[PDB]
Amino acid sequence: PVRLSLAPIGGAPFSLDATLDTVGVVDGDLLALQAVPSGPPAPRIVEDIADAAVIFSEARRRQWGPTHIARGAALALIGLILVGTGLSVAHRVITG
């Protein structure tokens, strides 16, 4: 149960009162059939300040997970090679 309207691709829906002239349609543009924008997002409300920390913090993608470790190892390695090389050459150019 929703309401629809017209909008140019890349812009916001057009008002239901304006005309296709005063809203600036050129003869041959490609309009899309999107919905009337929105309503309120209906804000939640939690009174216990304790759970006000666990609830409003999930929206982060925080989980440690066995993929923050994948990026972990490789990033450690590329550092090891680089300073592994530079040490020896510094052991090679300033001394011999």
């Binding site: 149960p1 929703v2 309401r3 009337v36 309503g39 209906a42 939690v46 216990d48 304790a50 759970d51």
Partner: protein
């Protein structure tokens, strides 16, 4: 204390569910005064009975 609050927290997230029901119902049968344009044509227009 850690045993009560931990009990109210499971009841505060249980009584907050009931609300999202009424607000689902009351909104199901009184949409904003623009949705009612698409009500007449469709198959649910004069649904209400006495």
């Amino acid at each position: 204390r850690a045993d009560y609050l931990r009990y109210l927290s499971v009841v505060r997230d249980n009584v907050r569910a009931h609300a999202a029901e009424q607000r689902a119902a009351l909104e199901w049968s009184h949409p904003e005064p623009e949705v009612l344009a698409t009500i007449p044509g469709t198959r649910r227009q004069w649904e209400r009975d006495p």
